[PDB]
């Protein structure tokens, strides 16, 4: 066909639209119905399109992703498990991005230099394992994973998996980009088919066009409010309609990115002329030309069916700000000042933070600079503290060159290193004490309790970068940039004009400094060294195989009440230090979950000693004494970030099963991967039949089968027993993971020994 390379760093790996077309055509001859865009890309990547059972919401698809991307907080454990597989080289184009371990303290260069010294052991390990297994390495300072992927690796029609739940960002360039745990990335790096439950498809038809203060962020702040955080579970969100040509390519990436907050499998936009324009300005005009020739396969079929349709008229949409402790609590900016007042949310904004991969594009920085130049023209500067995170080195070098960084510095902003920083709590925040109630507004995406600064009483609101800038200048939520007046230096009242700015640089992007490290694909004789006394890295010891018996008289470690995110199960911030060390990071296990017994965090009753104490310590006491335990959870258990540490930590400390009303997708997959039993109540009311003191027996593991429920005997202290039924979503492939003790153990059994 054409021999067009997948990226500038892999000149030999060609885009296979011929394969994609061939597979779409085998499948549509079988289904004889129009296919949505996500169906064309996903089914076009099936391992076996002639025989695969295809039913939305029901069958597991065996897929062949084109590439794997990892960020350094999840890459360490993905690579420790790849190292246990014993396999010599990764099977597909794979990259590591070092963006999660650079703490914000002093700003830019200073924080990067400190991070490189503090994290040397870990950056060393990743660069060395990268050179040895043939994984490309983007050095600390290079940029945030999703911005480097949009700029270099995402293209129309790619199926990409990343060990990070905001991998959907890549949907802004017409690709299917899906968040997974590190063990799923090991399947694909090992060359074995990746499995994904066939998604439902929610269509969102966009009408009209954006005007004035409304930006692409408002489309997904509005959708999250409509769908709620559990509304997109098990579905891909597919944006379509005449209003799509009104959104820049980075804007589409913004909207696809935050679809992670409604639990969606991923989001996607159809190939159009805004993507073509972005591909040509990022050195990939040959890929835009090839996608023009396969354009029919990169847009939805006429008359395709969506399982749910939502319509949004971009011309009526007005600025939104969401939170404070969930991303789906939506408010127009115009009314948040009055709702805050009512609910007792601090009206004064201590810190305004722009950037992160969600909103650090050249157009986002240009629009924020446009608001900032107006304030400057009246002698004002920010009343709140103000920080700016560039998404990549190329964006930092280009906004520096075109003068936007200096405008943002002149209004009082501090430019932070090109890294997650305050977005996952890597922020040395000193202006408030812990427990001090305060408000910060961000252009980020998640705004859950204690995530930006480990203070549970910080009220974080997510909005667009131009609104964070307007509100940072005002210093209060009780300011609506569309209506209200500011007072300059000179005494005159003035109103902020709506920001206008170029979406892409008129000149080319300035690539900034050299940050990519290609693997020697020659040499590769590296020795990965993990010191046996390291506190940051530890090689894995395999988990135990199943004993062949039912699980009797299980102790409940904790029955959790309400929301239980993976930041409640395995907190980030300070614990990022131990992401490559399973025993040390297991000391945060479930310390944020609320115990229904006393409604406290990290305070559970030890059944033997009858002392209330920390959840980690109690689980290690049960493990030490041979007591197998269970977690009982509520709805959407495991919501959030993809970190497989939330599944590895309960396995390591002696847990056996997690029984909930429902699971978020990535966490449920991660639990199955590590040999635990994620089970749901066949009747959710049965959550109330189980009390912390009850013991449980799960029966029927001997004839464990797809679609057959498991029986659970609740043993009450007084001698009463109640039998209830538990559903599970295991197919046969996955029951083999459970019988072997984990998916990695099963893979190593298939290597003939
Ligand atoms: O797992 C991590 O490293 C944290 C993270 O960036 C990742 N994520 O999976 O969403 C987040 O947003 O919580
Ligand atoms: S922590 Fe924030 S900036 Fe980093 S990859 Fe996740 S969403 Fe993006």
Say whether 273 is catalytic: no
Domain check: are 171 and 27 in the same one? yes
Cβ–ligand 1 distance for 645 under 6 Å, the answer no
Q: Annotated catalytic residue: which of 45, 67, 97, 100?
A: 100
Given 155, 172, 201, the domain boundary residue is 201
Q: What is the DSSP string of 534-555?
A: -SSB-PPPPPPPP-SS-EEEEE
Q: What is the DSSP string of 544-589?
A: PPP-SS-EEEEEEEEEB-S--BHHHHS--GGGGGGTB-HHHHGGGT
Residues linked to residue 555 through DSSP beta bridges, in sequence order: 629, 695
- CA of 126 relative to ligand 2 center, distance in Å: 19
3-state helix, strand, coil in the chain (%, to 5): 35, 20, 45
Domain check: are 22 and 150 in the same one? yes
Angle (nearest 5°) at CA 291 between 305 and 256: 55
Angle (nearest 5°) at CA 332 between 500 and 416: 55
CATH code where residue 403 lies = 3.30.499.10
Q: Annotated catalytic residue: which of 64, 97, 146, 446?
A: 446
- CA of 301 relative to ligand 2 center, distance in Å: 33
**CA nearest neighbour of 459 among 599, 351, 591:** 351
Say whether 643 is catalytic: yes
Say whether 99 is catalytic: yes
Given 150, 170, 201, the domain boundary residue is 201
**Residue 358 contacts residue 445 (beta carbons within 8 Å):** yes
Given the structure tokens 């870990």, which residue do they identify? 122
Tell me the torsion sign for CA atoms 176, 181, 184, 189. Answer: positive
State the ligand closest to the CA atom of 443: 2
Domain check: are 467 and 568 in the same one? no
From start to end of 400-523, where are the E strands?
Answer: 413-415, 438-442, 458-462, 485-487, 493-495, 516-517
Nearest CA to ligand 2 atom 6: 166
**Residue 714 contacts residue 694 (beta carbons within 8 Å):** yes
Residues linked to residue 441 through DSSP beta bridges, in sequence order: 352, 461
Q: What is the DSSP string of 126-187?
A: HHHHHHHHT-EEEPTTSB-HHHHHHHHT--TT-EEEESSTTGGGGGGGT-EEEE--HHHHHH
284 in a known ligand binding site: no
Domain hosting 336: range is: 315-489
Instruction: State how many domains the chain has.
Output: 4
357 in a known ligand binding site: yes
Structure tokens, 337? 């000042």
Burial class of residue 544, CB neighbours in 10 A (0-12, 13-18, 19+):
exposed
From CA 139, how far away is CA 164, in angstroms rounded?
18
- CA of 522 relative to ligand 1 center, distance in Å: 33
Domain check: are 479 and 352 in the same one? yes
Q: Annotated catalytic residue: which of 16, 38, 94, 99?
A: 99
Q: Annotated catalytic residue: which of 45, 568, 581, 643?
A: 643
**CA nearest neighbour of 636 among 203, 237, 258, 326:** 326
Burial class of residue 179, CB neighbours in 10 A (0-12, 13-18, 19+):
buried
Confirm whether 288 is domain-assigned.
yes
- CA of 687 relative to ligand 2 center, distance in Å: 34
Residues 6+ apart with CB under 8 A from 391: 143, 144, 146, 147, 355, 356, 357, 360, 361, 418
State the ligand closest to the CA atom of 146: 2
Domain check: are 345 and 446 in the same one? yes
| HEC letters along 59-108 | CEEEECCCEEEEEHHHHHHHHHHHHHHCCCCCCCCEEEECCCCCCECCCH
Which atom of ligand 1 lies at the shortest distance from residue 666's CA?
Answer: 9
The alpha carbon torsion through 198, 223, 160, 126 (nearest 10 deg) reads -120
Domain check: are 376 and 404 in the same one? yes
Say whether 443 is catalytic: no
Q: Tell me the Ramachandran region of residue 691: left when phi exceeds 0, alpha when psi lies from -120 to 50, beta otherwise.
A: beta
Helices marked H in 393-464: 393-401, 404-410
Residues linked to residue 144 through DSSP beta bridges, in sequence order: none
Q: What is the DSSP string of 245-280?
A: GGS-HHHHHHHHHGGGGGT-SEEE----HHHHHHHH
**Residue 258 contacts residue 326 (beta carbons within 8 Å):** no
From start to end of 483-524, where are the E strands?
Answer: 485-487, 493-495, 516-517
State the ligand closest to the CA atom of 642: 1
Cβ–ligand 1 distance for 585 under 6 Å, the answer no
**Residue 246 contacts residue 503 (beta carbons within 8 Å):** no
Confirm whether 515 is domain-assigned.
no
Say whether 446 is catalytic: yes
- CA of 166 relative to ligand 2 center, distance in Å: 7
Tell me the three state secondary structure of residue 632: strand
**CA nearest neighbour of 279 among 678, 683, 583, 7:** 7
**Residue 656 contacts residue 556 (beta carbons within 8 Å):** no
Burial class of residue 42, CB neighbours in 10 A (0-12, 13-18, 19+):
buried
Domain check: are 174 and 243 in the same one? no
Largest CA distance in the chain: 81
Q: Quick one: DSSP state of residue 639?
A: B
Counting every residue written for the chain, the total comes to 753
- CA of 575 relative to ligand 1 center, distance in Å: 13
From CA 249, how far away is CA 289, in angstroms rounded?
17
Tell me the torsion sign for CA atoms 504, 140, 252, 274. Answer: positive
> Which of 145, 262, 424 has most ligand 1 atoms within 8 Å of CB, for mutation?
424
Cβ–ligand 1 distance for 643 under 6 Å, the answer yes
> Which of 70, 72, 74, 122 has most ligand 1 atoms within 8 Å of CB, for mutation?
74
Tell me the three state secondary structure of residue 514: coil
Experiment used for this model: X-ray
Residues 6+ apart with CB under 8 A from 46: 23, 27, 52, 61, 62, 63, 64
Given the structure tokens 């055509």, which residue do they identify? 25
- CA of 424 relative to ligand 2 center, distance in Å: 7
Confirm whether 508 is domain-assigned.
no
Given 140, 167, 201, the domain boundary residue is 201
Cβ–ligand 1 distance for 356 under 6 Å, the answer no
Confirm whether 507 is domain-assigned.
no
Nearest CA to ligand 2 atom 4: 420
Say whether 100 is catalytic: yes
Confirm whether 497 is domain-assigned.
no
From CA 556, how far away is CA 274, in angstroms rounded?
54
Structure tokens, 627? 């007591």
From CA 241, how far away is CA 245, in angstroms rounded?
9
C-alpha of 93 from chain center: 21
């Amino acid at each position: 066909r054409a021999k067009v390379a997948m990226s500038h760093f892999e000149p030999h790996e060609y885009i296979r639209y011929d394969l994609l077309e061939k597979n779409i055509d085998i499948v549509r001859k079988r289904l004889n119905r129009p296919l949505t865009l996500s169906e064309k890309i996903v089914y076009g990547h099936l391992d076996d399109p002639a025989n695969q059972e295809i039913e939305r919401g029901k069958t597991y698809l065996r897929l062949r992703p084109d590439r794997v991307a990892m960020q350094d907080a999840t890459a360490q454990m993905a690579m420790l498990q790849f190292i246990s597989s014993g396999l010599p080289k990764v099977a597909v184009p794979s990259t590591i991005h070092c963006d999660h371990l650079i703490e914000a303290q002093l700003g830019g260069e200073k924080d990067l230099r400190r991070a490189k010294d503090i994290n040397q052991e870990v950056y060393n390990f990743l660069a060395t394992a990268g050179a040895k297994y043939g994984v490309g390495f983007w050095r600390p300072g290079s940029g945030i994973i999703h911005q480097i992927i949009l700029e270099n690796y995402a293209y129309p029609g790619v199926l990409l998996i990343g060990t990070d739940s905001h991998t959907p960002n890549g949907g802004g360039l017409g690709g299917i980009c899906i968040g997974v745990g590190g063990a799923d990335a090991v399947d694909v790096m090992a060359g074995i088919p990746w499995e994904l439950k066939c998604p439902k498809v929610i269509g969102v038809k966009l009408t009209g066009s954006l005007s004035g203060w409304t930006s692409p962020k408002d489309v997904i702040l509005k959708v999250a409010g409509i769908l709620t955080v559990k509304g997109g579970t098990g579905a891909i969100v597919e944006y379509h309609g005449p209003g799509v040509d009104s959104i820049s390519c980075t804007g589409m990436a913004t909207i696809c990115n935050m679809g992670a907050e409604i639990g969606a499998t991923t989001s996607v936009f159809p190939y159009n002329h805004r993507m073509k324009k972005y591909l040509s300005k990022t050195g990939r005009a040959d890929i835009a030309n090839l996608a023009d020739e396969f354009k029919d396969h990169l847009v939805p079929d006429s008359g395709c069916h969506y399982d749910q349709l939502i319509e949004i008229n971009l011309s009526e949409l007005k600025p939104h700000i969401n939170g404070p402790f969930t991303p789906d609590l939506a408010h127009p900016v115009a009314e948040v000042g009055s709702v805050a007042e009512k609910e007792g949310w601090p009206l004064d904004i201590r810190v305004g933070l722009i950037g992160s991969c969600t909103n650090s594009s050249y157009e986002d920085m240009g629009r924020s600079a446009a608001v900032a130049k107006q304030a400057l023209a009246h002698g004002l500067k920010c009343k709140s503290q103000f920080t700016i995170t560039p998404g990549s080195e190329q964006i930092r070098a280009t906004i520096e060159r075109d003068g936007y960084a200096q405008v943002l510095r002149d209004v009082g902003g501090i430019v932070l290193a090109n890294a997650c920083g305050p977005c996952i709590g890597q922020w040395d925040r000193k202006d408030i004490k812990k427990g001090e109630k305060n408000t910060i507004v961000t252009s980020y995406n998640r705004n859950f309790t204690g995530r930006n600064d480990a203070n549970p009483e910080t009220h974080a609101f997510v909005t667009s970068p131009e609104i964070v800038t307007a509100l940072a200048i005002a210093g209060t939520l009780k300011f609506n940039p569309e209506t209200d007046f500011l007072t300059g230096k000179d005494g005159k009242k003035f109103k902020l004009e709506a920001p206008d700015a170029d979406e892409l640089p008129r000149a080319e992007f300035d690539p900034g400094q050299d940050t990519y490290q290609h693997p020697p694909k020659d040499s590769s004789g590296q020795r990965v060294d993990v010191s046996p006394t390291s506190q940051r890295l530890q090689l894995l010891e395999p988990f135990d195989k199943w004993d062949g018996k039912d699980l009797e008289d299980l102790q409940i470690l904790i029955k959790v009440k309400g929301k239980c995110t993976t930041d409640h199960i395995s907190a980030a911030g300070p614990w990022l230090k131990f992401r490559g060390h399973l025993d040390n990071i297991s000391n945060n296990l479930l310390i944020g979950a609320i115990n229904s017994e006393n409604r406290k965090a990290n305070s559970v009753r030890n059944a033997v000693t009858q002392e209330f104490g920390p959840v980690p310590d109690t689980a290690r006491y049960y493990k030490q004494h041979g007591i197998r335990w269970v977690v009982i959870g509520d709805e959407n258990y495991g919501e959030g970030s993809s970190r497989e540490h939330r599944a590895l930590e309960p396995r390591f400390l002696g847990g056996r099963a997690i029984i909930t009303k429902s699971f978020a997708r990535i966490h449920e997959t991660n639990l199955k991967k590590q040999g635990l039993l994620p089970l749901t109540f066949a009747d959710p009311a049965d959550y109330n039949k189980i009390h912390p003191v009850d013991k449980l027996t799960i029966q029927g593991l001997k004839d464990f089968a797809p679609g057959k429920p498991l029986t659970c005997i609740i043993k009450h202290p007084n001698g009463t027993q109640e039998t209830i039924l538990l559903n599970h979503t295991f197919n046969e492939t996955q029951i083999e993971w459970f019988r072997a003790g984990s998916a990695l153990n099963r893979m190593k059994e298939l290597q003939q020994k």
